[PDB]
Amino acid sequence: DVKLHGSWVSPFNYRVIWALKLKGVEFEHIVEDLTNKSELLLKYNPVYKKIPVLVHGGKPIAESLVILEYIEETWPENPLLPTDPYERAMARFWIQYGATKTAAFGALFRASGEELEKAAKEVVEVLRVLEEQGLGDKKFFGGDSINLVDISFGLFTCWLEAIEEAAGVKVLEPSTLPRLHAWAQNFIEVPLIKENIPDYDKLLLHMKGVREKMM
Amino acid sequence: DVKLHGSWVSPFNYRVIWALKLKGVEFEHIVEDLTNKSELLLKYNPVYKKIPVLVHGGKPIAESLVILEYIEETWPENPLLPTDPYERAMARFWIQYGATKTAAFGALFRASGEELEKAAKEVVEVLRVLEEQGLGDKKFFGGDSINLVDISFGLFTCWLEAIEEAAGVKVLEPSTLPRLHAWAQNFIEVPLIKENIPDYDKLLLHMKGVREKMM
Ligand SMILES: O=c1cc(-c2ccccc2)oc2cc(O)c(O)c(O)c12
Numbered sequence: 189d190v191k192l193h194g195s196w197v198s199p200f201n202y203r204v205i206w207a208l209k210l211k212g213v214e215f216e217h218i219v220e221d222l223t224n225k226s227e228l229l230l231k232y233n234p235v236y237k238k239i240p241v242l243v244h245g246g247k248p249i250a251e252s253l254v255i256l257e258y259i260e261e262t263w264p265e266n267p268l269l270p271t272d273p274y275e276r277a278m279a280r281f282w283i284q285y286g287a288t289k290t291a292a293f294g295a296l297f298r299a300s301g302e303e304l305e306k307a308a309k310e311v312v313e314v315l316r317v318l319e320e321q322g323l324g325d326k327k328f329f330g331g332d333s334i335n336l337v338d339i340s341f342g343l344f345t346c347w348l349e350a351i352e353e354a355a356g357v358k359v360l361e362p363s364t365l366p367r368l369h370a371w372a373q374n375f376i377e378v379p380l381i382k383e384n385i386p387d388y389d390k391l392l393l394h395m396k397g398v399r400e401k402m403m
Numbered sequence: 404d405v406k407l408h409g410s411w412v413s414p415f416n417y418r419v420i421w422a423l424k425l426k427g428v429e430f431e432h433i434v435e436d437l438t439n440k441s442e443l444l445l446k447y448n449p450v451y452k453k454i455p456v457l458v459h460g461g462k463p464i465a466e467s468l469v470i471l472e473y474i475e476e477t478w479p480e481n482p483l484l485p486t487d488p489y490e491r492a493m494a495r496f497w498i499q500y501g502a503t504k505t506a507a508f509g510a511l512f513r514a515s516g517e518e519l520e521k522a523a524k525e526v527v528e529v530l531r532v533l534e535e536q537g538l539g540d541k542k543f544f545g546g547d548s549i550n551l552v553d554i555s556f557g558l559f560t561c562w563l564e565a566i567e568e569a570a571g572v573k574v575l576e577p578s579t580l581p582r583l584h585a586w587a588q589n590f591i592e593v594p595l596i597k598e599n600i601p602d603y604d605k606l607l608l609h610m611k612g613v614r615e616k617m618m
């Protein structure tokens with residue numbers, strides 16, 4: 189009834205895995221090969237031709253952020269968004285902030301030396317705004333348990349750690365971002381996340397390859 | 404109770420005006436000067452420091468797409484999104500598609516000659532996907548009346564027409580995009596939109612100035 193056309197490394201695919209497992213939705217995970225795309229993936233997502241694509245009752249939903257909101261409306265139990273409209277708007281605001289700024293992380297795969305240190309400092313400033321104005325003193329962006337904002341920022345945990353090691357730069361450190369660093373550790377220790385994250389060595393290998401091709 | 408920190412030319416500000424007028428929400432329009440920003444605008448939106456910012460009961464909501472969804476949840480009468488989760492996901496998918504591709508319109512203000520003709524053809528292909536897969540044979544993206552998808556695409560009407568005249572290129576024409584061109588004419592004739600759009604001559608003057616500074 190529910191199929192997820194995904195991958196074993198994509199952070200965008202992992203957002204959907206987390207949301208489905210939080211709702212207790214049974215699904216079949218179809219891991220696609222991006223070099224030779226299947227006919228189902230091209231028929232279901234003819235606009236971007238990429239993963240993740242959730243297929244529910246034969247009907248496709250593409251784009252991780254679109255899929256998350258579809259999951260939240262379709263399986264409303266164990267809510268991942270607050271009920272108050274102002275609180276929901278603040279959640280969507282921070283989700284879109286991360287989605288817009290995820291581009292500034294691209295420079296971490298391209299730049300080198302005194303240019304890569306400039307990109308890493310810009311990434312720290314992006315995360316500091318998120319820490320001060322978004323997280324604040326809460327344990328999670330969803331308060332006392334993870335919500336769609338935490339899920340949307342999950343790529344700043346082990347995927348970002350892998351990018352840092354592959355690029356030779358530090359971005360999310362306890363000295364400079366104390367509350368966001370504690371959040372990232374707390375997020376990764378949540379049993380749902382801990383049992384559903386790619387192996388670090390495989391993720392690091394992926395980032396090294398991505399940095400090699402993007403120079 | 405409701406204040407809108409806006410401008411007389413921003414298409415992003417006009418999305419909010421349309422949604423508020425469709426809900427029948429009374430509001431005070433505070434037109435800001437972008438060169439010398441007021442202290443209220445800096446306090447309400449310290450992340451982007453831009454308009455539109457809706458302030459409801461003293462609480463600020465920034466980013467036009469975030470404000471639209473806040474308006475839809477806060478004043479649920481005269482719905483601007485469908486009730487079915489799959490239909491709502493398709494609406495959000497097309498809204499995010501336009502938001503992501505709005506960047507390809509930037510080249511219309513920068514490029515010249517054989518480079519500007521390449522940018523205009525890429526814009527036509529972006530609009531063709533939207534026409535075939537998004538609009539189809541419906542009168543409006545919301546079916547028989549405008550919804551948040553029509554509102555989000557309203558910038559492709561007179562703002563785009565002004566960019567075309569300022570740049571000396573044609574993008575949305577009846578021969579090449581028959582259904583999207585008929586939609587744009589129908590949208591602009593909706594009395595709510597017709598009574599709430601900037602004067603074309605002032606909008607054209609704005610685009611000419613923007614193209615001049617961006618060369
Ligand atoms: O666009 C991508 C961005 C990042 C990323 C991770 C952490 C922090 C910032 C960005 O990981 C990725 C991995 C993939 O397998 C893939 O196909 C991708 O497009 C991306």
Ligand SMILES: O=c1cc(-c2ccccc2)oc2cc(O)c(O)c(O)c12
Nearest residue numbers: 412413414505508558559562563566
């Ligand atoms: O980013 C902008 C994009 C466009 C635009 C309009 C039609 C089609 C595509 C893009 O208009 C604008 C007008 C403004 O006053 C402003 O501050 C802006 O940032 C924009």
Ligand SMILES: [Cl-]
Nearest residue numbers: 200251252253
């Ligand atoms: Cl995605």
Ligand SMILES: [Cl-]
Nearest residue numbers: 415466467468
């Ligand atoms: Cl906006």
